[PDB]
Structure formats: structure tokens, C-alpha cells
Design a protein around this ligand. Sequence first.
Ligand SMILES: [Zn+2]
Lengths: 48, 95, 70, 627, 102, 156, 161
Amino acid sequence: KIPAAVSNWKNPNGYTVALERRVENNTINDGFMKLSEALENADKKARQ
Amino acid sequence: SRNVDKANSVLVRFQEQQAESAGGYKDYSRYQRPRNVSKVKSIKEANEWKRQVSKEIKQKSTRIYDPSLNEMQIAELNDELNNLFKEWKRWQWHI
Amino acid sequence: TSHRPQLEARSGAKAAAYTPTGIEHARLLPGHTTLKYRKSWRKGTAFGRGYINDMTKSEYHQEFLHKHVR
Amino acid sequence: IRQKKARTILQHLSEAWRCWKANIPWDVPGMPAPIKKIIERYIKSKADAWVSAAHYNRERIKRGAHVEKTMVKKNLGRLTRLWIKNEQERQRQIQKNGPEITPEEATTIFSVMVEWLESRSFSPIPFPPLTYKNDTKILVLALEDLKDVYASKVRLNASEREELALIEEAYDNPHDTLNRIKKYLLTQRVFKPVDITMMENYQNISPVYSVDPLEKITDAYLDQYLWYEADQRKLFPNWIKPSDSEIPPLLVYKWTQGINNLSEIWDVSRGQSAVLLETTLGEMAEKIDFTLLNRLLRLIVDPNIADYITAKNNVVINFKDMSHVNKYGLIRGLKFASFIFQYYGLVIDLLLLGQERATDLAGPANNPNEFMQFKSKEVEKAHPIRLYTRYLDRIYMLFHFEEDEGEELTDEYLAENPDPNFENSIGYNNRKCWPKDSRMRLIRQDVNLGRAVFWEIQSRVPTSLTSIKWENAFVSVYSKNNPNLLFSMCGFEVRILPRQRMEEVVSNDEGVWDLVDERTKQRTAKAYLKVSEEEIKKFDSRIRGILMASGSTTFTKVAAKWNTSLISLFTYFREAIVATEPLLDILVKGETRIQNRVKLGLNSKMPTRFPPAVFYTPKELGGLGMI
Amino acid sequence: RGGISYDQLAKLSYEKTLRNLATQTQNSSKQDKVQKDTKTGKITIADDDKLVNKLAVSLQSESKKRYEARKRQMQNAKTLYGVESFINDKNKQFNEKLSRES
Amino acid sequence: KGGVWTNVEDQILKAAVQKYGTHQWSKVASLLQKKTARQSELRWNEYLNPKLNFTEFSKEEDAQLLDLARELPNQWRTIADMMARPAQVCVERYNRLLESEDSEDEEKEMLAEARARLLNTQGKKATRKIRERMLEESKRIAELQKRRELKQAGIN
Amino acid sequence: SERKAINKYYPPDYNPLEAEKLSRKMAKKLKTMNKSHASIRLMTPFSMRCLECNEYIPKSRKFNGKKELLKEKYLDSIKIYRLTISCPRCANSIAFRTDPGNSDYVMEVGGVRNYLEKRLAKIQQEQEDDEELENLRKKNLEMSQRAEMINRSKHAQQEKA
RNA sequence: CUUAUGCUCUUAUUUACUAACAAAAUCAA
Ligand SMILES: [Zn+2]
């Protein structure tokens, strides 16, 4: 069975179709973690 | 510019004026009533005028029975059918 | 409406029963009328010392958009 | 399955192609997996034709080989989808695989800049207080810079009419609009999206960013404030260009003087040699990392504004359908994007030069140097980097080696990667505009010393910051086998002979600079000028932009566009046209296309009907006034 | 579960017409050839005038029942749902189709 | 001149996206007087989208947020995609979470114009075909009753 | 034949000036000359509402309509026109007027429209704004310290773990 | 039925309508 086609771009007959029919799952890796921690450890060393 | 402009220029008028003087053109589909009937001319001339009046009768008569839904307009349409009727008779007296 | 996709193509069955015209085209003029038959200053610094089936992920496509955008 | 069910399934094909062009993932819930397999097979099939026609037609537009006026607008519309689709994919590869800078690199990058500013004793720029003595004048210069867009044009749209009203509200209430800007620097961290568009230049496609007008005023005030307070506190040293004190042809002139004025470069009595390096910095602003960028700016800027700058770069970029968040790269379209782009370049300038030599070039903190000056000659003689300067993303390094320093430098390159077949002169690129006598002679000693110079410099900057490549590199060695020193500054193509390396000293025309020593006051070198081939094609593309935009424009607007583009060519490159033979052919073919546009306005191209009096008499007498 | 294939549904509708034909013979009980031509190859079958009328009236009556059952189903279909905004009947009809897909 | 959003214009915009779709924003602004297609797109993508996340803060969310704003300092469009939330709400709570450490007259006419434009779907060509078909049947009805009235007089 | 034609063939016996007399006399008797209501393609700049079939002429829809020179003459001498437009659903003509003094149109039959003490005070507002800016700058530094206090506590929670 | 059209010349000044085609307008004071 094929679902019917509701498009965001075209509406030839001008149908009023509900908003859910008209319109990620990952996390950051540890590289963004170790970058920001090293910049703070470089910064705290620079302040001392 | 619409062909209303292109039909009324000097050259198109000029050859009709020759065809009046060289033959049996003129048409009559061009001109007006003319306002008076007692000032009109020979019958063979007037028959084509009279024939023209029948043709606006047939346009108006076909227009009367439509569902245009305008009571005022069909009152107006009955008035032109009545005046063209009285007009059709005055050419018959002239005939 | 008035702007439609084809449900079927125009068949050659319809043009077969028509009567021909015999108009003379420039590309049906005689040509090729004969067939051929076969027989110490480096210390002070901070720090010194293949084909993919995707047109968009290709290496030539990356070299394209780096040169033609700039 | 009937004519009804075949009719509905073909609409998923159209919807998939629109999602592909929008770079939106096409996923229909409940779609049968064999049928989703068929549609993706053909969307990729249509995409291969769609992209390859965009490459094929792009190569036709650069050659000028009969592209339709509609197809130039279509090819512009195809590449801007391909550029963002390549941009959005590059955003996801940073998001999946982390930042390209490692924590070992960014610790050292941060440590270099702290070491520099501590030696400069740089006081950081504060947040602008309300009792700030220069505050009303910095605000006016910002608004006048925003207003100069609209003194030219006649018509304004609803966005532009909003933009002029916000300036007039700021002229009338100068104290009220400062309190709106000072509040947005302290509080506002989420910004309206940026609409991107792309400009056709027939050789490349340049990007243009459109910032919201109410956010544009607080950017323009910030950009006036940051550039004013940087120069009062002397942030940027002398080598960073554009200089605010010299025009780009004067930057060529001083640099060509300042080479010759430095001692003993031309002297090649011993085995000593001189090396000039030119590299673009690749995708420099494209590789700026915001977390690194926010930490670097806290050294020089009060962290409220350093937080204003980092948040403003993280906005939504909108084309028509296409929309993505700029996670990684710098937006150059911002007003204060110049202050970021040169400050991030100052970090790269310290990685190449080092802390010791960049102190020698920029001089001490209390009494800095001029652009190419040293405090004494002994400071200059140490450390073979003689002159450094940096345009936007283009660096210029002058190395003067001895014979012994040159042999050590070129040995350790050949130790790492030698060539038995002597193939280093193959990929070595030099200037194909000069004659073969005049360009760099491919001597095996100088070529291997040329690549060894670049190999030292490429290793000093990590590949996570900039992509410094040999293909973008131009190195010209001056030696006893090479009498010529060749470089290319801001569109100007320069060849240098000394006075003594010439066979005979012949008198020259306007295209030749006479380079004077400071103390002898004697002309000891000649600089031979040409227009770059990249600038010749840039001017040829402007003439096409006059013609392809003017469909049914009047004759005198075509003549006025020709005059303002011909003056912009000749008043910048003044004396450099004379030595350039390809440019004189473009001027001839370019001016006659303008005249043919008038002749296509009439239905006659006949030469007798159009004497020179029709085109060249002034507008006061009824002519077009073509120059 | 599933739908019914066109071989089974042809069989089931065949059996319903046999049962209905059986009760017509039962009700007719309670209330109380082939010649081929020589000249041509055409064949002639003698029929009673009854059972041809009875077949024709039954086919008409079944068409009436299915027409009015669908017509009454039309009436219920445009009187039940009124939650979502629409523009015409064909809108609500298409958005019933999307509700059937869920 | 930069206006605030009434709940009337809020409902017109929701019904506009329900018909026109999310990419036709100049279609939406045509219904919506005094508002820009940029402003219409900005509101639906920051406020009115029912996919958005306007709710309470679990302690997982607060620990995640203070994690992200520490690891990605001041990158709110990035953080709002990691939190799958709107962005200024994410700033609003980060502003609040740190404060834990403390020491019809016109509108209905627009709405009547919007109510009719959403419910008229045809264009020039279909409305004209309707007009020509009604006028053709009206000419037909006229000519037939002509023939009947002449048949009343006996003349065929 | 051609959009631009240099020569139009005249009859071999013709003249321009004698024709001008002749042509003028013809110009009194035609049906096209006596009726001069100008037919013009136009767009309505002021959404409509029909009064018979209550149709709405969207915003600015094309019409072939009829312009009429009005017998009125705005002020001592300014021209004023009356434009008429037929309705798509029903046969009904709706009329305009063009007011030259008030640039917008006005309409009629068949249609309806959709709708030192002051200087001391200035120093006071100057003083109020600086204190607000000092507070907001103080807020952001406090907001960082409030973030650090959670950051130091979470680090202490890591140490305890 | 009631029922004046047509024919012969002059008086002060250059202005209206079709737009499918073109729409960076730039720029020297
Ligand atoms: Zn109407």
C-alpha cells in the first residue's frame, strides 16, 4: 500500500491538509568535549 | 491598439466611399438608426436597413429568456424589443 | 488544471491510416547513396618539526566548487 | 493497479526531487521499501544529469562560448544549490567527526597568542561605557556607512524601506539608539536568520550575505568601535594589510621599494640567494572554529562582546528552500567580520614567524616599526625571514639565505622525500605571462631550494586551520642562475631585475618602476609591471555583466556603464596596461561590444552609419560620451 | 486477516447468488433445449419467458440495493466527520483517505 | 512599525501554512496585512510550529543544557538543535537556571478576507469555464422556451 | 505582413487633402464614432465585494473594462474618469471614480470595499540608562559566576564519585 | 406614428492609448 502524496511545495487542488502531514538522534562526540576542556585548562594556566 | 482603431482609419473609410460611388456596398451594418424615417430614401435601400433591425431583434429576443437573474436588465431588454418593434413597423409604412 | 502528465504516448497506429502529403524535406534529400559492405632559525616557531560513485561527493566536484565560487 | 494508483505514485517522484534540491531527506512513513528503492535509484539518475550539466555549462560560460541569457541565470541557480549542498555536508562532517583542531593544537594556538599579547602588553578592549567620549561619532560613521548603499539607488523594497527608517530613527535619537545597541551586546544571543544569495562573475560565483536591518545597525556600530579601539591600542602590527594608510597600488610600490632598500639581496657574489613566497591560505575563514574563536577573543575583548561575536556567527543560512545552521564556518557578510578575519590571521602570522621574529618585524611595543623597517641592521641580519606581509588570505615572505644556510635547508627536504628521476621541476609553477628568459629558470639547485622553503612553511601551520598547498604556492628564487625576482601583489604582476644583473641598461616606458636605494639615492633595480591574468578575465566579465543585464536599456546608460568600468580599470592599474598584450585585446573587443549594443538598438551594424562622432562626442552635444 | 482475492470473492459472490437462487426456488415451491441450424452454424436455445424476466429483475434489484446502500453510505460519510477544517466535500473526502492510511 | 502578533493574525498564519505549505511565504503574507513573509516564516519556525518544545525542564535537561553551554559556549542555534528545542527559550531557561544561584473592528475584516481566500481554490480559468458554461445553458434554456412559445402559437 | 512597413499601397488616383474632407463627413455617421466609452484592460486597486452574488475580486485582478470621460471636471480644470467592470460570477457592472485631490479611488454602484528644567530631565534619563547598562554588564559577569558555581559543584560531584 | 438631418469653412496648443521587452542603475561634484 502506498501512502498518498502530500507536498510542501505544490497544492494543485488547494487541499487543506493538517500541519503534521505538510511538514536528528545523535549526540556530540568527545572531540567537542576535550577541545573545550583543554581551552579552559589552557586559560586557567594563563591566568595563574 | 485594438482593431477599433484600425477599422476607422482614413484609408478604410476611403474605399467604402468609392464603393458607394462605384457599386452597391456601404453595408448599413455601420450606420445608426437613422433617427428619422420620413427622411429615408428608396425602398431597396431601406430593406437592408430594415433587415438590420431584425438582426438586433434576434439578439435581444434570444437574450430575453435567459436566467441572467436581472429583473432591471430584462425590463431594459423588453424596452429595446418594443422600440425595435415600433421601429420595424415605421420602415414598413416607409415601404 | 490544463497542465497534465501523459497517461500514454501518441501511437504510430493513428498516423498509419492517414493519407500522406509528400512534402520535400531537406534531410530526406539523397545522400550517402552507396552502402559499404564488409569483407637554528627553525626552533623559535610554534610547531613544524580512490573513486566514489557519487557525483556530489567526488573529488572533482570539491575542486570544482572551490575554484568556481572563491 | 490502475490509472488511479499509477497517478498517485508518480507524485512521490516529484516530491523526492524537490527534497533532493532542497537537501531535505525524503522519507515517507509507510513507504514500501522496494518502491522507495526504485525512486531513489532514479532521483540519483536525474541528479547525475543535473550536476553534470551544471559542470558542463559552467565551463562554457568561462569560455564565453555562446551561452543563452536564460541559461546563465539557470546555471547560477544550479551552482548555488550545489554550493550549499556541499556546505551543509561539510557542516555535518564536523558535527559527526568532531572539530578538526585537536586539543593539543588549540592549547598551543592559545598559548602563542597569550605569549604575544603579554609581550606587547596589550590592554584588552573594554565594553563601551555610556560615558564614552567618542560614542556619538562612532555611531554616526556606522550609520553613514550603512546609508551609502541607498544614496545611489532609486527604488527600495520593504526590507530596504525598513532599513532607512531605522537609520533616521537613530539620527533623531542618538542617545536612545546607543542604549538599544549597548543592551543587545549584553543580552541578545539569538539572532534572525541570514538570507544568502550568489553573484555571478562568469568565472566564479561570489557569495553575498543579507543580515536583518535591525541587527545590522548593532553590527556596524560594533565594527566601527572594534576597528577604532584596535588601532588606538595597536592590536594589528605593520604587516597586516589592507593598511588603512595606503592604497593597494601603493602597497605594491612600498613592498617593491622595501625589498630593494634592504641590504645585500642583489649581491650574489657568494652562493647567497633570495626567496619570495606567495601562498593563499586556502579555506581560512571557512575553517574558523567558534569555540577556539570565543576563547581567543577573550584575550583582546571584554567577554560580553566576545560573546556577541560568537553568537552572531551561529545563525541560520537561508537560500530559497535550503536552510541550515552555520555550526562551523565564519560568515564574511557580517560587518565585524573584518575584525575577526584579520585577528584570526594574526594567529597564523605568529605560527609562521614565531614569537622571536614577529617581535623583530613589528618592533617593540612602545615604539613600533613602520611597515618594512628594523630597529637596527643587526636585527635584520639574524633570522633569514627578511620581509613578511599578509593581505586578506595571501602571505608574502622574503627569505635571504647564505650558501651554507641554503644547503642545510634544502638537504633536509631531500632527506625526507628525494627524487631519483629529478622530477621537482615538473610540478613547479611559475609565471606563464612573462617570457621564458624573464620568468624563473628551472635550475635543479634553485627548484629544490624553492620547494624546501615551502616545506618549512607548510609545516608551521596545522592543516586544521588553513589549507596551504603547493598548487596555490608561487615561489621565486633569486640566485646566480636566476636574475629575476617575480611576485604578484594586489592584481599587479611584478618582475624585478637589479641594475647590475641586466645585460645593458636600456631606457624604459611607463610600465617600469625605477627602484631607488635610500642612502645612495641611486636607481639600482627595475620593477616590470603587468596586470594579472586573473584581473584581465575579471574585467572581461564586467563587460559581459553590462551586456547581459541590459536587454532593452537606453544607449547612454550602456555608455555610462562602460565609462565607470573603464575608469575603474585604468585608474587602479595605471601604468600596468602598457606591458600587457592580452588586456589590450580585451579593451578592443570590449569597447566594440558596447558599440554593437547601440548598433543592435537600431537594426543596423553598418560601419558607415556610425562614425566616431556618434559614440565619442560628449553628452552636452548629443553624443554618448564614451571614453 | 488481509483482503479477499478476486478468485475467492468471485467464489463467495457465486455462492451467495446460488443461495439466493435456491431460496427463490424454495419460495416458488411454497407459494404453489438446443437446436443447431442446418443452413448456418448458428445455435438456438428454447427458453421460457419466465426466468429471463426473473434474472433481469434480480440484476436490476441488486443494482438498486447496492446503489442505495452506497448512497446511504454517502450520507453517513458527509455527516460523521467535522473536526478538521476543509474547503469542499472533496477535501473531507481526501482527508478521510489520509485517516484511513493511519 | 515593527508590530506585535495578535492572536487573530496567529490563527490566519496557522490556517495559511495548513493550505499553502511552509515554503510559500509570500502566499502567506498576502493574507496577512502589516506582516512580512520574513516575519511570517520567522514566527512559524520559532513559535507556532507544533513540533516545537515548550514545556518544563527535567533535571536531565538542565544538566544537559549546562553541559552544552559549557562545551559549546554561546552557540545557541547549535545547542537548540542538540536539545531539540527553540533557541530563545533555551537562552531564557539558561538565564533562569543560573539565577538559581542567588545572593476587532479591523481584524475581523482581514479575517473575513482571509476566510474567503482560503476557501476559493480555482483561479481565472476554472471560474471562467463555470461562467461560460452557465451562460451557455442560459442561452440554451432561452432558445428552447422560444421554440415552445412559438409552438404555443402553432408555428413550428 | 510586417510590424514595420514603410509604404502602404494607395490607389493610383488618391490624394491626402481631398480625402481629409471626405473622411471627416463619413466620421459623423458611423456607430463606432458616436459611441465613445473607452474600452480599457485594467486592474482593480482596492479589493472588491460583489453585492449580488457576493463574489470577492481578490486583490488586483485583470479586467477588460470600460473607461468613460465623466462630465464632471475636478477643480477648475482636472480630468476625472469613471471605470466600469463586469463580475465573473454574475452579470453586473461596478463603477469607479478617480479623485485627484484624494489620490485613492471612490466607488459606486454594484460593489463595496473590504477594510533648564527640560535639560535637567534629559540628564536624568542619561543617568537612568547608564545604571541599567552597568547592571546588565554586572548581570553577565554574575551569570558566568552562577554558571561556574554549578560548574565547580559538578566537578566536586565528579571528585566525590 | 410623429416628424430637421445632410451639405460648405473657421477659433486658442501638441497630446492620449498597446506593452508581451528591459529592468543592479552604477558613478565623477
Ligand atoms: Zn457578482
